[PDB]
């Protein structure tokens, strides 16, 4: 129960010790108004069956508070329970985000997509659900067993053995299955991420035949799924037979005691009547931990991921802040060395681009440049060297100052679901319509606006896939020319829009009237025409630099690139 | 909908009802022996005669539970066999479906039809028809035995009975509609996941976590669980307080204490009220909190069904080589807004075709159609003669290859993203296919060489995956490839380089080429341009040029 409480808010454990109290709380009275029975009926059966009037209003008086005190624990279950939600996923809301890029591998983003996915009511109630019955019913035969040491010790010391039973027959039954639920919680995740696979990547899937279920990587996903819950639904069999024969043995226990106290004239048949009554209640938890036991490992399981993604390493991020109000900065590289793993992708890297102008970085596949704009924009950190926005280490940069500095056009544009409006408003929710329009002007998002029937108010599919290729990269110009950063960084903005839309985009990301450092990564030579400043990356190194004229004129690697 | 899709449990689940009466019985039978037995003793009844009874009856106390453990043992089998068939059924289904039901849908919502509404079913499997089994036999027989017993205890018996009832109906009718809407809130929040997952570098840069959608539709889901769990969780609490055997033995005590100490009932008598009355209670609570279930087990089986009942890809019964031939063809993606109107056009072997023009004009959906991915709204499309749409999944992708404009790379290595077409290929035909797509030599840097996955976040860059998706059709190997907008991301170089490859692999092959530098279709032995879903102006470059039409103004925007 270590990791439940690790994640409650440190502004919520009062309420946790209030409902631990009442938890123990409940359980007494439970115990207590089990056992007064006892008592009751001795009093009821006995000749002047007045005497059970007191018994009768204890009782009435531990059932009261039993009410009241159920119901301020299921209140208070039920608040931690929404209350650990809320806080949970809103910090790995805020987390994610400044989580490193590395950090999401195909096994960590489902970890991630999981614990996001645990934000349904299965979580939320988790308290009232899972930890109060839990509780409730393992610890009640023990207080009924305290309980009845008041009426004949050695009864209580039979059920208190019983209770020794069940608790050991909790641990086997959890040592069990955990192997089993493990794996089958594994291959459930990989079966929901080869699922969300499946959806996603339906048209080469179809092209390649790898669809139907005996041919594609979701069926064997499924069929692993199947297996391992059929194993862990095996292995869950000697669980619950453990659990039978725990609840053997305290019936045995529990009935050969009674049996033997009354033989021996040390409890008197009525007692033993009532006995019948205590015995069938302290019997009632065995059932319900045999049924709820189960649910402990998919709950550990869930309550792991989510855990694992707060403990998620997050980039630096200092306090500085640009000097200059809204001035377009000077970004350089001083020996910035970066590599993705082991694989050295730039070793050092130096440049200065002058404030306000516009570079283009050029140069062949794998060369090194979207990295370059990710370290420009953050996305990135070196390894070793500073990136400096207007003298500034990026690293120290306040992220929430970091993030204004820059607007970014990524290689491959992803546009969220929803309309179309929508997408282009995410460089500035709050910008005005004629900010809005100039935008979509310049990036000639307006030219989906006559043709397309929606308008701007038309939906786009999961990423832009209900839009083409060009128009949602138009869709995702517009929304970084919508935001006013200094900084704007243009990688493969042209790659699919053909030659007019090519021509005006560029031109309009030219003509931008706001003053930018514009840095552009192109493979056509028509995308840098207005370029003042050429660096040509190639396998991590700047080569060749300069101006388009001059670089065409030396017959460097620029023109043999553009030959 | 859903009685249709679980009539193959109908028996299993009848056994189980019936099962569960002899079960609960079961339960019940140990406490009427003891009743009886416990009456004789107070009789004054020799022991003699009570002894193999007493005995048989004090080990037969929860008989019944263990039954009951071992049918839920076997209907959870029942349950995971049938959701592993349904799933199965789901994935064969959508694998034949338009991809029009997959773009409108999304990748969240099909996780969910497939994981969480096949999830959904197990308590109407696993539980609903054991705890209506139950809750109808146990309660009725218990208040039957104990009314003509004693009618007078039995009455205020009957008081938490009602208030349960009450409880139940109003808890009932207040969730009915919350968990109506709550699979949509479900979707939408996996949705949003995802797009929150997946477009990390938009929110990143633009926004961050504040700005984000996805937060905005987290608390909104947030205060959707509140508002559906505060009344339903205090509902089923009240309910348990009801129901409790503590409950039940308080008022069976109330109504019989002043019963017993006046000269009106027998102490004797209150037996069986002390020793059935508190057993029936947790047999309704069942069936209080599995309503809940039956109600997302029923809306998920008709989700599902639907699901299975929808139009698909069928294969007609109509019934040179290297051919394709496009006649009159029509598309619409939705009603009535088309995006291809009434375009002729046939692609020979041997032969390039370049389909040029202004994006958003339909080249991608194009290509689609000759794929099959959607059908012809009119008009048809045929390859070797034989009509797409009386071609099976197998005659016809083994005919076609196609490079989409989206490189969707899957998760596994690179070895497996190449030759995902045909996976049983030689590593060597996955080199010469890397090689032609000039890839092997950017595998042969990679750290574990040709195995190393291709994972979310553990990508390449754009034009690699690119040639990661040439390399792919170049293994597929088909009479026919289609490119979508392929070497874009390429640069000159490698763009030269694969685009000899595929010209040195398509010699005698047929060749359609969907490309916005038209520097790069200057060769097409027939350019079509494609202006608004239709074609304007078909020929070679030259004559395209001299025409003065689209295509020259295409060409003088680009240098
Ligand atoms: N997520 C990643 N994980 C590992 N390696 C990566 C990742 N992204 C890129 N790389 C590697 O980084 C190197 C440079 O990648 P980068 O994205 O900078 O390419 P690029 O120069 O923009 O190429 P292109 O012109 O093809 O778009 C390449 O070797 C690529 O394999
Ligand atoms: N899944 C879809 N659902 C609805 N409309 C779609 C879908 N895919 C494409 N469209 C619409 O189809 C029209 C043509 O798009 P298409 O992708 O076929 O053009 P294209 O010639 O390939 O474009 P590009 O040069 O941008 O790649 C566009 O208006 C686009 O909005
Ligand atoms: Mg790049
Ligand atoms: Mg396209």
Redesign the interface.
Known sequence: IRTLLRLVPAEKRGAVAGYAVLTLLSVLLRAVGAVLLIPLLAALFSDTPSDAWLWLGWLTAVTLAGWVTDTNTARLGFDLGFAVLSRTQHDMADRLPNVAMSWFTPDNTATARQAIAATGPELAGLVVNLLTPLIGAALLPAAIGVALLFVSVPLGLAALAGVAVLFGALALSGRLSRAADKVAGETNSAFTERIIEFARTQQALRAARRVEPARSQVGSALAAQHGAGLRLLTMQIPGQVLFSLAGRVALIGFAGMAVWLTVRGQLGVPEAIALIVVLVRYLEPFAAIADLAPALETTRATLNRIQAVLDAPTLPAGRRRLDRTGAAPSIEFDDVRFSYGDEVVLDGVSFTLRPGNTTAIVGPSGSGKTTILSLIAGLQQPASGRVLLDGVDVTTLDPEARRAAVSVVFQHPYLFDGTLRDNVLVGDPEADPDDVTAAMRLARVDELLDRLPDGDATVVGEGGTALSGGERQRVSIARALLKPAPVLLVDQATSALDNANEAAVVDALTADPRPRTRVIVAHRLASIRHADRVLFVEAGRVVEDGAIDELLAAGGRFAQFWA | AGSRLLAPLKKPLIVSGVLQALITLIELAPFVL?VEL?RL??GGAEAERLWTLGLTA??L??LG??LA??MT?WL??VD?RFA?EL??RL??K??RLP?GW???????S??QL??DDTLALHYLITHAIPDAVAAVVAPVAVLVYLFVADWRVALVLFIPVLVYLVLMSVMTIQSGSKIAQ?PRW?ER???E?????????????????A?????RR?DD??DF??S???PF??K???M??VTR???F??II??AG?PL??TGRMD?VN??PF??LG??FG?RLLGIGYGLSGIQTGMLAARRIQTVLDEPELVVRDRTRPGTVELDRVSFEY?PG?PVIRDVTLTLRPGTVTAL?????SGK?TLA?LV?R?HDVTQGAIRVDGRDIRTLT??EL??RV??V???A?????SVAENIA??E?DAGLERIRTAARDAQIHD?IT???DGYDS?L????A?????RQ?V?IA?AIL?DTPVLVLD?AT????????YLVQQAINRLTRDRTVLVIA???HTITHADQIVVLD?GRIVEVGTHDELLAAGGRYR???????
Request: proline share 4%; aromatic share 8%.
């Open positions: 003891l416990a003793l107070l004090v080990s106390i929860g539970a263990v453990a071992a043992l959870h089998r995971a592993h799933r199965g994935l064969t959508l694998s991809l997959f773009t409108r849908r999304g990748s969240a099909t996780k497939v994981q709550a479900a929040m996996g949705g996941a995802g797009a929150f997952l997946e477009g990390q570098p938009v929110i990143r840069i633009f926004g961050g976590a700005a984000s959608r996805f937060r987290l889901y947030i669980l509140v559906w769990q505060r969780v205090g089923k609490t009240l348990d307080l055997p503590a409950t033995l308080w005590l109330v204490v017993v100490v102490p209150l037996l002390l020793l508190t057993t947790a939705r807004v040029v023009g202004p994006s958003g991608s689609a794929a991915f999944a197998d992708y083994r290859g196609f989409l404009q989206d969707q790379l899957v998760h596994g995902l077409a996976p950017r840097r990679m750290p996955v994972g979310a976040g553990s390449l860059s754009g034009g690699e040639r998706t792919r597929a907008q874009a991301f390429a640069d000159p170089e490698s763009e916005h530098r038209l608004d103004g295409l060409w003088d925007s680009g240098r």
